[PDB]
Amino acid sequence: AWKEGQFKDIITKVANVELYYRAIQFYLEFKPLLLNDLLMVLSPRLDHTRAVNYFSKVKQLPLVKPYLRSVQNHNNKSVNESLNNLFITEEDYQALRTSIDAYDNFDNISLAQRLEKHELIEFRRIAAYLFKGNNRWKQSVELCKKDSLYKDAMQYASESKDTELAEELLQWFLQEEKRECFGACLFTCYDLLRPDVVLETAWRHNIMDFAMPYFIQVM
Amino acid sequence: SYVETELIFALAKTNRLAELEEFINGPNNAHIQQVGDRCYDEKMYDAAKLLYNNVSNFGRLASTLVHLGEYQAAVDGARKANSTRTWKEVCFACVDGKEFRLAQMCGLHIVVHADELEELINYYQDRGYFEELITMLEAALGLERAHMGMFTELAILYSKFKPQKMREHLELFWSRVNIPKVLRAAEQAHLWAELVFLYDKYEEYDNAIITMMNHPTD
Amino acid sequence: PESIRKWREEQRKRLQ
Amino acid sequence: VRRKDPELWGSVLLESNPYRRPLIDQVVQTALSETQDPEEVSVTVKAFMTADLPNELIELLEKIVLDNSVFSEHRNLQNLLILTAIKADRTRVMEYINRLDNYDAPDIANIAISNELFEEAFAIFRKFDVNTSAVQVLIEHIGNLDRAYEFAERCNEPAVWSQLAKAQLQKGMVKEAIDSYIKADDPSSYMEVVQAANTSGNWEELVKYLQMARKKARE
Amino acid sequence: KYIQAACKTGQIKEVERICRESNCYDPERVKNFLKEAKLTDQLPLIIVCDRFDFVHDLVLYLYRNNLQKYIEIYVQKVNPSRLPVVIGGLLDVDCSEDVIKNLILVVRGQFSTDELVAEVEKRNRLKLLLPWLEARIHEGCEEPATHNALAKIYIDSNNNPERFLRENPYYDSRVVGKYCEKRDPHLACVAYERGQCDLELINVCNENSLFKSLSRYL
Amino acid sequence: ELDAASKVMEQEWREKAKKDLEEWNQRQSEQVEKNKINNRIADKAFYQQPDAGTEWEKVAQLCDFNPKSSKQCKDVSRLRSVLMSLKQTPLSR
């Protein structure tokens, strides 16, 4: 006595919510192809947290991925975490950026600590982005310094708007032969550096670099 | 204000955005929305975008986003404008660009109206994308302001494009759809297996017995 | 692609 | 529903009729048919409250009527659902709080902290950005410094840092009470800090506290 | 020049009077100088602007710069008859709906009902007038304007509003029938039956509807 | 007999459901493998041949202060840096 063409409308007219879970179990047991439509039509009266918990207990998140992305508009913590885990599993880095830019109801620290160990450049970049968004200044810069030596950590140090941070980058560029980007680091961190000590360390204290356009703009 | 208006007009003429974006952010005190008209009148795009950005004038930015090429920003502006013309232009642009992921999303707020449904049908018939129209109208059930014409046109398209799925929709929404608009389409399709059932549902016993006598096969 | 041709032809053939 | 009469509901709801559950399962759908005015709904809910219905009978009606319907007002619809869910002592309180607005937050928070439910009041205080009333209750009831420190690190307010310093002083953490006052710039209660410093020689961190309080309270 | 001299020392109380009394000046330059020289307590513009009907930019300027008491005190004391225009202007930039729902609860003086329902229909945001209509029906307002809008909202509420049409005689059958003509004629039939609109009943049922309704009514 | 037939149909439906679940899992695994292959190709494309009077040109290419940087905050230091970049632009050879 089952007819999908009528059940898909009858299930939305019930009074309780346990029948929604019974229908979810029926679809997981017999016909998972219409589970997306069932979830989309039951969403106005379905508890998304318990649904995500059940989907994680049965491990069917890739089959409900579109419904989870649709529910993501409600900024649910469990839905956000499940979508982030699915994007990590699928080696996606664009959907992760979209999710972290649109919503923030999740633990950014744990996600960053997981992404920093996934050996991917995009994952560690997203981790540094989350760290700098969590007001963890002078920490994400040192984290990305391991790889972002091609004028990327300079941007983080500049947008940090803090002092005694770009000076460390200058000292690192002066101890090791990387004086080529010294002027770029000076220009990006103009409002965070002092020309006196910059010129002193750049000329007398270490290898005699010119760094003249910086002082020209200062004049 | 006229001075700054003519200044930004001359900047849009030579596409001097590098200083136009700075003059807009400052105390221009000009007459906004006056040069934005000449932007599309003289076919000068990429200039009205910065004009409508800082003013929050959702409804006219889509007219430039259509010719720009981006479709995500078109939907992001239409969801903020919530005007029929904006949604219709976004849907027409998505149809021109062979886009279907955002076409259904933008048409969900167009199929709500009765007159715009005919415009959508006319736009989708000349392009041949009947499957996209069917998939967009399938989501009409999951709405809060559906009317008779939507399901009527859905049943018509089922009777004309997908005969293997028209029976269920016809038996389900027989009372909601109108009588003449569906019977005329079914007669044009010459489907005698459902005309008798529809006549019996609407108590049209004369046209039912006439059809049964003229076609007693099934 | 002007699918009206097949649209009419298939239906007319089935009806005939 | 039509003939509003509290005496009728009182005479019918006496646990004598074995068909009370089908009557409830029918009235839960019949009540949506009126859709005219909340006066009849008010009379019916008053009759229900006077009949002393058990749990999972009124809060379900409120969840059905308030969501996906017209009756989304706030005329006594704040306590009628939240207090009932608290008396039921279930996880439905969090879902009701997350799916409701324009409700009196301090009163229900006080009612919750008076009862055994405390995480709901914490979520309420986090939703309305009430940091002080959350940390104070967390310290008074449980005193979990591990969560209070993270909560104070998340936000940024001198009152929150002062409350954290007071909580650390309650636990005898003089070493952290200086760091909790540097970020707050609060020169008050210095006499208590001086009295607590005499209990254990720690004249290395109090120096900075006094040097910073000198520029705030010339005593 | 007198207004300019009134800007050298604080005399804002003497500026709001001459804007209403005098009617032989150019309001363009006046409002430009007012928007340029911020008085920090300026409210002569919130009168002359609606006096010359240029509030389409005043609402935007208030939403951009600051919105604390200006529109509030305006609707309270100055002119409550322009509330729907300000609500539409605030909906143009898509502001918070809770702010508007809280502002509409404030008491009113001179006010028009049709001008607000027209704006919320143009914006397709009829879900904001529910608390105001509830307060009106609780106070005992026996006005057809306060009931026709509620009936149309119930029509758009995706429910079965049959008891409300057969029990409430306050609304107008013409508007409900014309609005529900292309959407659902089954409710328009009951509306016209309650309104005794025989000609409308003919023009609606005989065109596209069921004929048994007329057979049972006539 | 009808109950036995219903049990047989339920067993057949369970078998078909297991088959469909296996097919969906295989399709998802194939899609994940294709995505991993695409990510490996992208990581291999990341490998380039950069360095460890063209020095100034390479430094500019790395850190060009193009006027497009005006999208940031209107800081006076950023304006001075943009002016210095415009003055150094003629050094491009």
Author numbering:
A (entry chain D): 1385 to 1603
B (entry chain G): 1167 to 1384
C (entry chain J): 99 to 114
D (entry chain I): 948 to 1166
E (entry chain H): 730 to 947
F (entry chain F): 115 to 166, 188 to 228
From the paper:
Clathrin-coated vesicles mediate trafficking of proteins and nutrients in the cell and between organelles. Proteins included in the clathrin-coated vesicles (CCVs) category include clathrin heavy chain (CHC), clathrin light chain (CLC), and a variety of adaptor protein complexes. Clathrin plays a major role in facilitating the formation of spherical vesicles by making closed fullerene-like cages of different sizes both in vitro and in vivo. Clathrin triskelia assemble into cages with pentagonal, hexagonal, and rarely heptagonal faces.
Here, using cryo-EM, we have determined the structures of natively assembled CCVs that include clathrin, adaptors, accessory proteins, and cargo. CCVs were purified from bovine brains in conditions that ensured that CHC cages do not disassemble during purification. The refined clathrin cages were further subjected to subparticle refinement to improve the resolution of the clathrin layer. Using subparticle reconstruction, we determined the structure of the most abundant vertex, which is asymmetric and formed from the intersection of two pentagonal faces and one hexagonal face. Atomic models were built of the mini-coat HPP asymmetric vertex. The model by Morris et al. that was built into their consensus C3 vertex [pentagonal-pentagonal-pentagonal (PPP)] was docked into our C1 vertex. In this rigid-body fit, the edge of the vertex that is between two pentagonal faces exhibits an accurate fit, while the two other edges with one hexagonal face do not enclose the model starting at positions close to the knee domain. This discrepancy is consistent with observations that the knee domain changes conformation to make hexagonal and pentagonal faces, while the proximal domain is stabilized by CLC. Consistent with their study, our structure also showed that the CLC C-terminal domain stabilizes the tripod domains that are critical for CHC trimerization.
